[PDB]
Design a protein around this ligand. Structure first.
Ligand code: CA
Ligand code: CA
Ligand code: CA
Ligand code: CA
Ligand code: CA
Ligand code: CA
Ligand code: CA
Ligand code: CA
Ligand code: CA
Ligand code: CA
Ligand code: CA
Ligand code: CA
Ligand code: CA
Ligand code: CA
Ligand code: CA
Ligand code: CA
Ligand code: FE
Ligand code: FE
Ligand code: FE
Ligand code: FE
Ligand code: FE
Ligand code: FE
Ligand code: FE
Ligand code: FE
Ligand code: FE
Ligand code: FE
Lengths: 91, 89, 90, 90, 90, 90, 90, 90, 89, 90
């Protein structure tokens, strides 16, 4: 899964790698589920797809908080922009 | 890009799609840069890789805040866990 | 998403496609998380990886139940083997 | 194959990996076959595609039962939702 | 699924396409199942993988027979080499 | 080219793997060439694509016969269905 | 299979595309077969893999000649370097 | 991530590899963002995408300058063509 | 080849897309050839790979100059860092 | 990069592999560039893509000449069809 040899990577880099690729997978699942919710023609399936989708967001949030706690610049940048008002590009 | 045909997708769903794949690319870039920072044996290159890495986190944070503002459940779950103390689970 | 053009596909076929690819993604997520649980050396991350893992199984079970209800042979074959005692190849 | 090196993976995790990726391929085969059944314009081929399709479901059911027997939460979540009536999300 | 636009492809070509990619998926399934049979450390799983493996070969054989019946050169070349003795490259 | 480590695979399993992926590549070439034969608007190129196409079938037939000679169930299933009449699903 | 829409591509460009992707597939087949010839531990299979490999080169040579005849710069550059004496980089 | 085994690659080659794939990822991000800027129908999102897009260009420029300083032919060819006027092919 | 439908993209954006993926392909070729130059055990082939490698850089520079002339921020950021002395950061 | 372990491949085989995948990359660049030449609406860019394209053909011809000199069947088959007048399939 790593693009550099594991011998040269420090473990904390590998642990953040494990968390990052997890967040990526969760984000992808949210998008895919959301698209299928719009396109589904069976309401019973749409309810399940929507249920799972929203839990993928929870999975991502938990993993992102870990990243914030284990990376100073994740914490800096997330504090600047998350839960803000006014233009995001100027915060 | 989209799995489903866009004719059946709502405009907001496609905009959230554009934001989600953006955050995914940022996360992927952060990971790659951090790995190359560890393996690079040229400090001047490492300085550039590290600089870019930390700005991808800014790009991800900006886009993620937009998702929070345009999706109620992103807002719900991010509020539960972000900037918290104690066991994440 | 689909291999054949949507013009020739039954809607029910496309809905089962949506359910199947979901189960595929859920199973893949279970596998990935479980491997990272074994390899992770940060206990707080392992707890998150393990927690998500087991909820992916819940997502798979729910989506799979829908397939069972909307495809007769999924229902027949799942009933033959699920929650059984003897050897499975029997 | 695996996303983590096999030295750090537990014996059981790799066996469940082999079972999981098998079910994924079976599910993928069901979907592909079913789409080609809708689009095929040769009835004898359609019969073959449909015949194989339904046996892929049997292959998946067999492997999934093994997962249930070798993973506690697969057993819990599958028992909760499989062979039920009423709203699945409930 | 196809790759030239279907408007210029003949219906028979697309049906053979549906048959060919099916045989490809069966062959791929045979190979992987066989490898997991060798590597599996759980006897109950090994039986399931091997059972499915040999049925994938059956699925492939059926589709190949269809190809033989619907393509003159498949019929010619398969008759030359299948069920023979002596060096195959002869 | 294998999920599983080569140390745990039997020699015949790895050799059959080499044959199987070859047949897959040959089958893929047949389908693509045939599609390009239908779509090509240059007859001399079409002649080349068709010539190559039909030789890929020979390559596939030769390799498949080897699988028949080195795998009992490939041999069992192929005689059941190859060079038959009536419904293929029987 | 083309990266730009077929409406804006000239007929000659799509035919050269069909030839080029064919030569690529043939080249890939030559490389894979040659590697399996080195690794194969079954001489009868090795004979087949070697036979097919060398005919892929013929398929490639035929398709390249067509490219040379239908592209001025393929003809110019191939004439410069093919069947020459001395350092190729000159 | 490298195509050749790392033991035979020079340290400088691997460092240039790290810089090159980074520039590739930056360029890819610029292209993706620019397309989403045109298609986005949400002004607040478009502002973020465009902001990030233009900073990806800065990341590429810095890494590209490093390549120029650590590769003689990058320096030569970048010297000839960047910040010029008139036909680039001259 | 594009992610968004071409109907909604500005053609100038599509032309820049054509330029970007070309440079990406050129960069990928430079890296691969350079790795094969280090690993090749045939000197005459190594000469060809090395020759091709250095011309891929020429191809990249030409296409990169076109991007600079047709994108304001390419021109701005390339003016800042190209042909400079001192720490790139 | 290789399909088989480097431990089992002959040095001559691996070098031919390096040339083959190089020719493949050049051909792919020719095809993509030629398509972008047809679709481009900016003449200054069209000039660059066309220029690069034609040099990729040169890069490919040079590498193919190396293959001709270091592989007997490439030389045999290329001599048969290259620089010929008359039906290629004859
Ligand atoms: Ca939960
Ligand atoms: Ca990417
Ligand atoms: Ca280090
Ligand atoms: Ca995936
Ligand atoms: Ca739940
Ligand atoms: Ca697959
Ligand atoms: Ca059966
Ligand atoms: Ca049967
Ligand atoms: Ca022959
Ligand atoms: Ca050889
Ligand atoms: Ca021949
Ligand atoms: Ca002509
Ligand atoms: Ca900055
Ligand atoms: Ca030259
Ligand atoms: Ca030149
Ligand atoms: Ca002559
Ligand atoms: Fe999840
Ligand atoms: Fe970024
Ligand atoms: Fe999930
Ligand atoms: Fe199966
Ligand atoms: Fe099957
Ligand atoms: Fe072949
Ligand atoms: Fe061929
Ligand atoms: Fe960046
Ligand atoms: Fe080039
Ligand atoms: Fe080139």
């Amino acid at each position: 899964s790593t693009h550099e040899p594991l011998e040269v990577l420090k473990e904390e880099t590998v642990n953040r790698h494990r968390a990052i690729v997890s967040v990526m997978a969760e984000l992808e699942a949210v998008d895919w589920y959301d698209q299928r919710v719009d396109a589904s023609t069976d309401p019973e399936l749409t309810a399940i797809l929507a249920h799972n989708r929203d839990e993928e967001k929870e999975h991502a949030a938990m993993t992102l908080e870990w990243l914030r706690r284990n990376d100073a610049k994740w914490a800096e940048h997330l504090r600047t922009y998350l839960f803000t008002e006014g233009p995001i590009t100027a915060a």
